[PDB]
Amino acid sequence: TYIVTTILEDPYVMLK
Amino acid sequence: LDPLAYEIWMCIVFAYIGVSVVLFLVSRFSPYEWEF
Amino acid sequence: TVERESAEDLAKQTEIAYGTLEAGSTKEFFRRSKIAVFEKMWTYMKSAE
Amino acid sequence: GIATPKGSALRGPVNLAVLKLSEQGVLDKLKSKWWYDKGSA
Known part of the structure; x- marks a missing residue:
């Protein structure tokens, strides 16, 4: 398993 | 009276x-001239 | 003079609330619609109180 | 675009995955689900 780097940005990536 | 609010009246x-x-x-109260 | 028709007239205002029958073809028509006006109407109807 | 380090082995599979997702209407559905469904005196 490798790391998919990402960023917090609505509505792409949100904490449920 | 509707065009003007009750506060205006x-x-x-x-x-x-x-x-x-x-x-x-x-x-x-002016003694120089003293109808009003 | 300001005291001097369509689908938009309902979608466009918010003073008159408009509803449908529950568990009916009309509700299901609005829920699964993809037309801009009908999607706007459904989003309003689903979250109206 | 989905990025990868230059010289990565995931470069080609990721490109083809995005093409498959686009040609299958997945990206349109995800976009529609995450954007449109938010909505005198």
């Missing part, structure tokens, strides 16, 4: 009484 009556008393005061 109340303040017109207050202004009418205020102007009348002030106009009478500045006209009668």
